[PDB]
Ligand binder design. Sequence first.
Ligand SMILES: [Zn+2]
Ligand SMILES: [Zn+2]
Lengths: 370, 369
Amino acid sequence: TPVVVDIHTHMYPPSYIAMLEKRQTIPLVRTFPQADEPRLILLSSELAALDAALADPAAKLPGRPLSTHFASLAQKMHFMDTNGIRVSVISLANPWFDFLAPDEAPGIADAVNAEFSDMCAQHVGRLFFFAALPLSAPVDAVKASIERVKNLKYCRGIILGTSGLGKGLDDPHLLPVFEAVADAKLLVFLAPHYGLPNEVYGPRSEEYGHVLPLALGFPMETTIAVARMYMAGVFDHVRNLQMLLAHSGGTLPFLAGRIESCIVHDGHLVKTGKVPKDRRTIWTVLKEQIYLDAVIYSEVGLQAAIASSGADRLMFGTDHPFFPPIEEDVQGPWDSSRLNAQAVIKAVGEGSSDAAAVMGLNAVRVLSLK
Amino acid sequence: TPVVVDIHTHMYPPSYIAMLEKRQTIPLVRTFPQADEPRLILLSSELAALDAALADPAAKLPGRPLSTHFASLAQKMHFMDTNGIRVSVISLANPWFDFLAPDEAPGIADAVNAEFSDMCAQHVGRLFFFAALPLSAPVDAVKASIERVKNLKYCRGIILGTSGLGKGLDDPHLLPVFEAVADAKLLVFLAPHYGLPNEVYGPRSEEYGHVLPLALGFPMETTIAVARMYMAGVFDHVRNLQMLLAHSGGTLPFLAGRIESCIVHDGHLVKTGKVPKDRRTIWTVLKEQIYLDAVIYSEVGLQAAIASSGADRLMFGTDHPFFPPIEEDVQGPWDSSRLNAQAVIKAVGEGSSDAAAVMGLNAVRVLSL
Ligand SMILES: [Zn+2]
Ligand SMILES: [Zn+2]
């Protein structure tokens, strides 16, 4: 029954953009008279560049262009139709709701999640979504939001950043949040955004474009976050919790053996009773509570992910619209999508049952996509 | 049986420890009557507890103990004999010479490298070494040290930290060093130490012991350093350069596909002609100028490493003495050694030519042992 499903695909809905347009501090959106597309500005390191362009428009247009590829539902359906994708499970892109004031957050989250549901209702059977949460609000407001989003048509989970409530995912205050999501049977899609402190990339990083933070920072951030969750015993505390990890777990399948070795050889952990004989290894968690997307661009990475979680726990994604072709027509097929489909083919064989599972059937089963 | 070679194994030699004992600032070594081992003090935070133990024989011993596992050649030979290792290619452990003053550095590097050669001479055919370089000194002094160490008996390469001269491996000033080492036919062993800024691990990190900095920090640092090297075109500028990467390239075999995709989809690089059609991909460099150690603890990671560089470019290592058994006899076989040996077996099969290659024959060929 080989239907193709994309579980890693993003949008900024109209209500989200309008919310950002009203903002007077980062992140925010400005509409310039020169260009046709609004400007999303996130990191303060480019607010200076805005002033330049707001004065000498000869200065480059700052930040990211809010293109049709981010904002347009019709564009999303076009991408799907021209890349052989039947179903998309869309999610709000970074920075989600993390920056909002505690009082305004639940209301804004409500309207945005409402719009995602309505967007999905436009193309019944082809669109589902992960909801984002007002994580800057009190935990009680977060729990009320979870009970709300689970009753929205076409909602199939939660997209979660690595900062959690502000102290990362090993924050003890997040445990009732994880419990609430797990009990509601919502899959948690963990996604990176904050990367690594730019200092790690050295004085020449600018010369390499965005290669270092995107290729290294994001997947390393994911690895660190899940490792922290694991070490804190989150997976043992909430046994029904299920995680989908962005970019094949970042680097987790490659480092899992090293993680295990470091645990069992850690003097502090062993001597304080933190390494009991019956402990659930990261390998066990990878097979029982973790799903991995297949956004890894090579059969090498993909094979490691499959060995770690199993072919029934890998899910095809594209990370649309983050990697458009630079020279080829953006309205034509995207090689950033094709690269991952090719990786799947090279790893498990075209037309195989494993291929059908990874390309969509795992997502249909796990997320009840009807 | 075919020779087992350990290419990833560390020591602090007597001359290195003696030098550290004379130091007044971090890093330094102090000995105590109430302790049978010298103390390695490496952090500014530890200086506080030092004066306490320096005052009271009652207070706690600061820093980490300099055990025989780090310091004794007999202990190294015992480890090899009880873990089935015929040949070790030993190297100075972090922090090497990175902290030394520019003028004092070349002299200290000379004495330490000389002692390494002499140690190897005590067990002919079983010991070779990677030399460490005085990288805090002017490049001319570094090149001089390079020409010195290549004529030392049993020297088979160079150990290099990720900081280089102090600005990472994509520092233009480091290009003459890479050229000098490559021209001298010395393999460069790249090893981590600086990890990642501790803040990335969050406020609970100490509860997890050293798991996060060791399991994540070290290999991620290696990945970042080599990625920077590659993006700067170092491998293209020095075509005869050969580098051995610690911990199976850190995470490189897993992220190589993502790196390539990010390069070809980078607007700034493509539109400035830095992505020409004839560019050597990271996959090509992984097969031509990179060797990977097999210190990866799982056949999952090892298979990814083998797929990336080939079975003829993987080399067994133990990272001795960094992961001793915590409960089991430290004088018996090390779990941290056998995990990697088992990983080789489960990946390529026991008794296979690939197993013999990874376990030592690659190192014999590449390092002329
Ligand atoms: Zn994404
Ligand atoms: Zn090491």
